[PDB]
Amino acid sequence: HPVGFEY
Amino acid sequence: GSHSMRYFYTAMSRPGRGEPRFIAVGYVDDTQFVRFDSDAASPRTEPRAPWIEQEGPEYWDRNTQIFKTNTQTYRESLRNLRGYYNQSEAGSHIIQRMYGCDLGPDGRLLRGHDQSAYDGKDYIALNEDLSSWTAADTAAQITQRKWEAARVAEQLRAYLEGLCVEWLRRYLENGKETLQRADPPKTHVTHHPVSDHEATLRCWALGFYPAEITLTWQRDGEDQTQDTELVETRPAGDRTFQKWAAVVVPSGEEQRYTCHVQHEGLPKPLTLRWEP
Amino acid sequence: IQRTPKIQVYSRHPAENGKSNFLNCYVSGFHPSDIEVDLLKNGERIEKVEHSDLSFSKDWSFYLLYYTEFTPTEKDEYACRVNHVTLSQPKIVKWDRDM
Secondary structure, rough: OOOHHHH | OOOOEEEEEEEEOOOOOOOOEEOOOOOEEEEEEEEEEEEOOOOOEOOOOOHHHOOHHHHHHHHHHHHHHHHHHHHHHHHOOOHHHHOOOOOOOOEEEEEEEOOOOOOOOEEEEEEEEEEEEEEEEEEOOOEEEEEOOHHEEEEHHHHHHOOOHHHHHHHOOOHHHHHHHHHHOOOOOHHHEEEEEEOOOOOOOOOOOOOEEEEEEEEEEEEEEEEEEEEEEOOOOEEEOOOOEEOOOOOOOOEEEEEEEEEOHHHHHEEEEOOOOOOEEEEEOOOO | OEOOEEEEEOOOOOOOOOOOEEEEEEEEEEEEEOOEEEEEEOOOEEOOEEEEEOOEEOHHHHHEEEEEOOOOOOOOEEEEEEEEOOOOOOOOEOOOOOO
């Protein structure tokens, strides 16, 4: 399950 | 043995050809299990291994929610990075991200990963402490400052030590018949004359899983590292992998050469020679 | 900078004339990700060729597997046609059953 911010 | 879970994100801008594409794939070891593509007719998380199919609708909805959100976020991030490098709006650029957890043979967390690249070059990485960042340049330093304010490292640490390991262990159980089965290489040596007094010995390894393998030629017990042509390990398309190592040998000296195979699925490491 | 694709053309199972098999073209080590790959039978493009989902290696370079079902013979020549931004002209790698 993936982790649930911008660069 | 040791196991890992990895997600690989690719975000690709394409000025004049619509909004940036976002692709995500998930792997357990060398087995892909999920995909998402923002360019699909109806973008949704899709299964790519039989053992993930049993997951409920909530799993698939949450995954799709995450990747749809990431599609939007990475488009903003591409805009941001273009600005950090004073780049024109005309060029196509790529952000890649790779994250996940490693487990030791007992099942405990060995280490976590979260790394990003821009146009194929390392950009920013979470350090092994899962608390601090390594920024490649002054542009990445801006990203570092943002993520420190948003407490991203702390959120990633919580995921990597918790849910990442929990889900990986679950997948390893549900897919134990494949994920925890090492398939040994089928091995043989072929002989190909090139001239009157030179011939190629090629050592083959076929049908193995996982991809990790050691294939070496030895002459009189000495490694022929420089003299060996060693092709990249390649997928067969049935989950298994293939590899070969070749050395050009003087004719009549073939028996002085030995191929050595090391792989998890073998009861014992193999020593091979050409059988005329 | 940009990286040119490595190309391997091979079968899934050992090649036996008259027996159904899978023809693989593995492209790897390339950057950026945009790439054109076709499998050829006697120079002609095979239609229903599938490919793997885009992923990448530890060095950030991309890899893809292109594949189709095929039946090898003595006379039929197979090849993989690859185009990439790093290449000035599409590269042809012929299928060799010993490779």
